[PDB]
Amino acid sequence: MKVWLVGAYGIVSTTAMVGARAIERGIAPKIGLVSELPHFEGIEKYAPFSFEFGGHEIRLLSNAYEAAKEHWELNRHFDREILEAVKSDLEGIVARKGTALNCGSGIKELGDIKTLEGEGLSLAEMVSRIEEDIKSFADDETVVINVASTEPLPNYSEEYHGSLEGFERMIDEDRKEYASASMLYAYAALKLGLPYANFTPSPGSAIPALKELAEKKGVPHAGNDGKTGETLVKTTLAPMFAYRNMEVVGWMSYNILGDYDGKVLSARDNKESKVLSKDKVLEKMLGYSPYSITEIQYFPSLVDNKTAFDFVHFKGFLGKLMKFYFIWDAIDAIVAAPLILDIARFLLFAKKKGVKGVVKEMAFFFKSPMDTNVINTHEQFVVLKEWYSNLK
Amino acid sequence: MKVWLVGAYGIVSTTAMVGARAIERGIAPKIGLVSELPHFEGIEKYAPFSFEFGGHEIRLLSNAYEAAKEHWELNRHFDREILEAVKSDLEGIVARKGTALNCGSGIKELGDIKTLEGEGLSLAEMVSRIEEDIKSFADDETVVINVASTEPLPNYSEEYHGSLEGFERMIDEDRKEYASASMLYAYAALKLGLPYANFTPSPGSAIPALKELAEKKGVPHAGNDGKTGETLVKTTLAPMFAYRNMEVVGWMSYNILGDYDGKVLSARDNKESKVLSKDKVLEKMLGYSPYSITEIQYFPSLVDNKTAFDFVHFKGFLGKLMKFYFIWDAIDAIVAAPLILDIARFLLFAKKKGVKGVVKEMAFFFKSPMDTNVINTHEQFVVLKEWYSNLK
Amino acid sequence: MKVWLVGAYGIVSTTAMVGARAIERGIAPKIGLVSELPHFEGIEKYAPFSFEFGGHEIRLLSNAYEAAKEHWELNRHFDREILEAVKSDLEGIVARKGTALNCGSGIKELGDIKTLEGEGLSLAEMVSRIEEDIKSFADDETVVINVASTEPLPNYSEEYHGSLEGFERMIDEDRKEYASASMLYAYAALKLGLPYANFTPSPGSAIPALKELAEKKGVPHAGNDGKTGETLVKTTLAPMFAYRNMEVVGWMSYNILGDYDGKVLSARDNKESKVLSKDKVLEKMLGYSPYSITEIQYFPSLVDNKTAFDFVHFKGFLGKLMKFYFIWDAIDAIVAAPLILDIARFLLFAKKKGVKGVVKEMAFFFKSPMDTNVINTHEQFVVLKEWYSNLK
Amino acid sequence: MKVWLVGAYGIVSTTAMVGARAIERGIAPKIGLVSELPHFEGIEKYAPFSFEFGGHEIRLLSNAYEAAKEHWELNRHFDREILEAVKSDLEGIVARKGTALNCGSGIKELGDIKTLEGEGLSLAEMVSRIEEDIKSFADDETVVINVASTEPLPNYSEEYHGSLEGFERMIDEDRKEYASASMLYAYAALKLGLPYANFTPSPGSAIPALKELAEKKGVPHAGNDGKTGETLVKTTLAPMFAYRNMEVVGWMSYNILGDYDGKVLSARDNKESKVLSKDKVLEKMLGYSPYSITEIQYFPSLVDNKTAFDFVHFKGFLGKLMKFYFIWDAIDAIVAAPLILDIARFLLFAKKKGVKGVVKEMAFFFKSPMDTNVINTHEQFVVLKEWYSNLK
Numbered sequence A, B, C, D: 001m002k003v004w005l006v007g008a009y010g011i012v013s014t015t016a017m018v019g020a021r022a023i024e025r026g027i028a029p030k031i032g033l034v035s036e037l038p039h040f041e042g043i044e045k046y047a048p049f050s051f052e053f054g055g056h057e058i059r060l061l062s063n064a065y066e067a068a069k070e071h072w073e074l075n076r077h078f079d080r081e082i083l084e085a086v087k088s089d090l091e092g093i094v095a096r097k098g099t100a101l102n103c104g105s106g107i108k109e110l111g112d113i114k115t116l117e118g119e120g121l122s123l124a125e126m127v128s129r130i131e132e133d134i135k136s137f138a139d140d141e142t143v144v145i146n147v148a149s150t151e152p153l154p155n156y157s158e159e160y161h162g163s164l165e166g167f168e169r170m171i172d173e174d175r176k177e178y179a180s181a182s183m184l185y186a187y188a189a190l191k192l193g194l195p196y197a198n199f200t201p202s203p204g205s206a207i208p209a210l211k212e213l214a215e216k217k218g219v220p221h222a223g224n225d226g227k228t229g230e231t232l233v234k235t236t237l238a239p240m241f242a243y244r245n246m247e248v249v250g251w252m253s254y255n256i257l258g259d260y261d262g263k264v265l266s267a268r269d270n271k272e273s274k275v276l277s278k279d280k281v282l283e284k285m286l287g288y289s290p291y292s293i294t295e296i297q298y299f300p301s302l303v304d305n306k307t308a309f310d311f312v313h314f315k316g317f318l319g320k321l322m323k324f325y326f327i328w329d330a331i332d333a334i335v336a337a338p339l340i341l342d343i344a345r346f347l348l349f350a351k352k353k354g355v356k357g358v359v360k361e362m363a364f365f366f367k368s369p370m371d372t373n374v375i376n377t378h379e380q381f382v383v384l385k386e387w388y389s390n391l392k
């Protein structure tokens, strides 16, 4: 299959590329791949473990190898021998110039960038470039996945975001104020009939306009925002207090990281998207709102080793308060990268099975799953299992 | 209903007694009670929140109030005002002298004790005293629950434990070497046609002899070993690594506590029962065995504030190792006490619904659930929900 | 001796009052009191353990007992029996209306308040009321200690803060914009010839004007900002990396608390004072600046149980990065309250020994010690010991 | 200078060798080296940063490079580029066959071993081989340092360990039952007039016989047992509670590690030496004994990444209990290796300054410092500083 990655030179993106190729060359295990679990036996009939890559970027380096090595230098999150073995393949992946339209002040932290809007192009002309890039790459086994820096919350508009006609009016009128990069890539993917997933908390396809578009075009889509670490634990663990009829009175979630993701989320406007997505899961699972605090702070020496500190304050029998702590110490690109490969395969599977619109049953992958109040990790896993069985 | 508690002066036992009465007098919330969750609406048709108590003990204090206050003095795990309000009721609960037969060297740590076997009685004569105590108390709405100190692993015997005839032969021949206290209380309960649950990792009714007996008598029973804290988290959290196709390579579980439970488990023979029950859950959930260490150590200043330290070492994409820590800081009697009330109500419900033999669907309460490989907390909760719906 | 407490109805203040009296009535140990350590034998010649209290407040409750009980209800940080035993004594402590001039937006969180500036008084007239209150209480064995809510960083002024003449000009001209409450109480104390200590990060006497005043008047003073918990650990532990020639690359300090202190510090202007005081210690000890983040967030269920989460990222041999975590779980009023009693006794001792100006050797008590670059806890303790020996 | 390392193929030993050479070739910083701190300016007059290595082993691999690479493969605790750069130098370091006499059951975990006692040699003949090996290597700038696996507590003997004549009688009579390997290497070093340090909790030179010998020979020696991680923190942090007049009621110290050190300490007899050395520090600092538990458990996936979990339970004002947690996550060979280089330089310095007998002022390096009750890390550092200034 083929995967077009928005933010193709990022660490999540390059590590998926490194991993896919290491696994194909037979020099890496299949650990981390949800699509490789026993329940999904037979997926390879529809989506074999076979990947060609391209994508859009605003940080233009020569190729995906140079991009992968920049992240490897700082993080060393896989062996030098894996880097070397996949060098050839990754040198042939060259990203195209994308758009950073309305992606917030945090984009400044990426350093030297070049964008379509910087060239003076209108919305219609930007869409045409994005579509031409994708369609020149795409086949009938192609998916588009957004793994680009997290945008701020969009300037929402009922007219421009509430219907497909309103959104196409937005493009026609060149109303840039209401367009964000993530919307434009999602729009392009679906207009081309390509399945789409948004691994970030940027709006992407999660506006009514684009949900209408995906349905009309009969195209499957999924999102939003990869559930990889702290939020994974929160949605696995919060149900335990509910099952035991305990009241959660407080939940603290504090996250420190560096690298480009920590750099972008250092900006208050970009951060808000990620923070709300991490925070809001609690009420959906419990039925009520514990006092919750969720923060992300830049902490440069950790690079992509995002570390989370959580504290849960809870009541039990007779009103007695009790306390639970956790620390997650993990590399973000290592828990994220396989989910990109899994999302791509499950979208391809969904496409071939005639699935259209939001694939709500892929909620398991996401912190803010579209079209569903199923948040509990256990419930989401059962939904994913049962969905695949129903269509297999 | 009526509940006969083996180990009636213990902290789990007295706090269930304090709690039941506080809730009946309308001075405490219903927090902590699984049987009070919305899904179990209508349980009160079969098992209303209404409790009379008695039980067996080897530490003879005057009454359950004096017992409750001894634990309250050291722990202050509920308000002085709750203690005062329930004093009358608890002063009327007087335990009967039980048996500490083959309950290990840790029983020495309980201080001043008096037992049936100390009086020179044979197995048959001990059984008669235990039965007379229970039957003088029991009605058609009576359950027996074991919350006594954890025994060592029994001297197992195919002849004496493998069939009811073999076990009754054991009693007839006065073969004390193969009898443990917990077996004798379980035997007595079931011979009397009373539902039974074992909240400890002592063998109790979990031998083939007594499982045969419960079936023959048409009596429901449940166990073993309350899942309250660290093991609750382990069975909620370990599935997350499986769902995400990660390999757990190591899991460390270190527990410190004081009070009478920490005192008994300071002995190496008593400890082994609790340790194996906490440790063995991992393989059943994952399909394989991470290097696991599970310890319990005495740490007197914590009293009944059992604190657990866990560390999970796990592999993800490309073989990368990553790390997860947790600390549970809770009072053991507060997470355990409501489960005693819930177990009693669900046993009464099961009894009235014609349920007989091991109620395997009550696995949710237990670290070592009888007759089931369902260990995942989420799965167990669904099984409990669905079981109750099926019989309601 | 006599202690006039600014913020007399606060939890630190009332717990010092509760503690002093419990210890005098012989119903509490002397644990927590630095002045009770063997090295300080003979202090009781100059400052016996004997305390009468008064102070200023803006939250007017009837008396210090009602104030103490309000905090006890929420926190239960000492026994009901201690509360009862000291009720009489504390009912006779009645605070006087003080000033909340330029104490930031966080003061709004205190609820119902009444202030001198609210009555329409000028700076000169406010100073006269504050002085009249203190002088009506004071004797030759009286000290004034600031334990009031943390102010924002002041609008600094060279003219008005840089010399005593400039500060007295400020009062004469009624230039309120440059006066803060803490400055006015410190000014009043020193004008009256009374020793002064500032337990908060508010400016207090730590401006050149008031340092000049204390010297001229021959009056000892000490501050700023009680070092009680997280910062205590930081100044004990950071030296270990220096002694071992390790580079600290990052230090994260995250603090959650409730109660009135957490409420006031929820405001961004008030918070800044506390944050800088906690953060700045690192460079002074190490000679360089690790990337440091220090936050305080409101977390209401913890009440006065301030909990801190720290993470230290450090380099050792060959550049290898390594990691250290800590969690402090303590009640803030319990670690602070004895230091108020100790500060008072050491100020009285200093006064009687002819000490004047900043008592820099009391740095041990403080996060931002005036007139000293001695920050290491070990060094500060030796300085305090040696100071007392020199004057004994 | 020259350093003869007992246990020369171990990870602490090989990493000191790797580090020394990387630093000499100018490809590594001097981070981690206490002897490189500003206070020790001028040490290079007596002990320049210049090292030639040899030693004894029982695991015979071809050379120290092969040994270093075996540990590097599993741990990756320095760059492949450092490994490559020092390969030549380390290939020329070839260990000689030593003795594992009475080194406990844990020695079995080292795999394929060869020893002097296995050849049938008497004590006198073993001593001669050990001496011949060392003297063939040694010059006037040579030190011997023990970094071999931790032995069990020795079979102590007043006659054989209490005087030099008694110890030499032991050798003469071939009384193996009372000799341990570490004693024999220490004996040989001192008989040869070479300074000696013991980085392990094995007895080494810490018996009266060998202390008498070092004095008579006018030879400086130091030990015992490198203070590198958890115990470093404990001796830095415990003084904080004393300075603040708090009572420590409980201290838990739980350590997990793998590699060869974790393997040897998995044995109960070997473990006891390390456990007592880690545990006993508390009383010496505080004056009393908190309930303390100290454990080390094998946890193979961590390899040389020893992780420690500590919990401190402490009383403060009015008897209130409060709680402090810490987690140390570090590589043991990285914190240990520079101390070997520092110990060697400070021993050479001591030798040239006419120092003889136990260098008690090197206590800073050690968990069980010989001839001193100075345990507090801060105090030890001041003692080391002042010692060096006095002799410089």
Ligand SMILES: NC(=O)c1ccc[n+]([C@@H]2O[C@H](COP(=O)([O-])OP(=O)(O)OC[C@H]3O[C@@H](n4cnc5c(N)ncnc54)[C@H](O)[C@@H]3O)[C@@H](O)[C@H]2O)c1
Pocket: A006, A007, A008, A009, A010, A011, A012, A013, A056, A057, A058, A059, A098, A099, A100, A101, A103, A110, A147, A148, A149, A150, A151, A181, A182, A199, A200, A201, A225, A226, A227, A228, A229, A259, A260, A261, A274, A332, A333, A335, A336
């Ligand atoms: N576990 C995880 O790492 C995880 C989990 C959930 C969500 N996410 C989200 O995934 C995204 C990727 O994470 P990452 O660590 O790879 O960050 P990264 O910064 O290393 O990668 C993002 C890449 O996208 C590029 N980019 C930014 N805006 C773009 C635009 N509009 N068009 C094209 N390219 C653009 C950047 O130049 C960068 O190379 C982030 O938004 C992050 O918040 C990551």
Ligand SMILES: NC(=O)c1ccc[n+]([C@@H]2O[C@H](COP(=O)([O-])OP(=O)(O)OC[C@H]3O[C@@H](n4cnc5c(N)ncnc54)[C@H](O)[C@@H]3O)[C@@H](O)[C@H]2O)c1
Pocket: B006, B007, B008, B009, B010, B011, B012, B013, B056, B057, B058, B059, B098, B099, B100, B101, B103, B110, B147, B148, B149, B150, B151, B181, B182, B199, B200, B201, B225, B226, B227, B228, B229, B259, B260, B261, B274, B332, B333, B335, B336
């Ligand atoms: N969260 C929890 O507290 C928890 C969880 C799982 C299992 N358990 C188990 O529940 C049991 C009770 O815990 P606890 O904290 O109340 O301990 P406890 O020691 O305070 O209570 C046990 C009581 O039973 C008595 N006893 C011991 N052997 C007896 C015998 N053979 N016959 C009659 N009485 C006997 C003791 O005197 C004591 O009063 C223990 O076995 C414990 O391991 C507790």
Ligand SMILES: NC(=O)c1ccc[n+]([C@@H]2O[C@H](COP(=O)([O-])OP(=O)(O)OC[C@H]3O[C@@H](n4cnc5c(N)ncnc54)[C@H](O)[C@@H]3O)[C@@H](O)[C@H]2O)c1
Pocket: C006, C007, C008, C009, C010, C011, C012, C013, C056, C057, C058, C059, C098, C099, C100, C101, C103, C110, C147, C148, C149, C150, C151, C181, C182, C199, C200, C201, C225, C226, C227, C228, C229, C259, C260, C261, C274, C332, C333, C335, C336
């Ligand atoms: N361990 C600790 O608790 C600790 C450590 C260091 C510093 N501090 C500082 O000590 C102070 C007291 O802490 P607390 O927990 O008692 O808080 P608290 O809010 O319970 O006490 C402060 C009291 O002062 C009053 N107040 C505020 N402004 C005033 C003014 N200008 N004049 C007179 N009264 C005023 C408030 O009404 C309140 O009763 C805070 O500034 C805090 O940041 C506390």
Ligand SMILES: NC(=O)c1ccc[n+]([C@@H]2O[C@H](COP(=O)([O-])OP(=O)(O)OC[C@H]3O[C@@H](n4cnc5c(N)ncnc54)[C@H](O)[C@@H]3O)[C@@H](O)[C@H]2O)c1
Pocket: D006, D007, D008, D009, D010, D011, D012, D013, D056, D057, D058, D059, D098, D099, D100, D101, D103, D110, D147, D148, D149, D150, D151, D181, D182, D199, D200, D201, D225, D226, D227, D228, D229, D259, D260, D261, D274, D332, D333, D335, D336
């Ligand atoms: N931070 C630390 O790593 C640290 C701190 C304090 C003490 N120590 C102690 O230092 C020692 C070395 O630690 P390591 O991690 O290098 O362990 P290691 O097992 O990797 O090294 C010990 C080496 O000595 C060898 N050996 C064992 N007995 C011997 C004998 N009698 N004669 C000659 N060689 C012998 C072994 O074969 C091995 O190569 C251990 O005793 C350990 O407990 C280490």
Ligand code: NA
Pocket: A323, B329, C329, D323
């Ligand atoms: Na805690």
Ligand code: NA
Pocket: A329, B323, C323, D329
């Ligand atoms: Na870690």
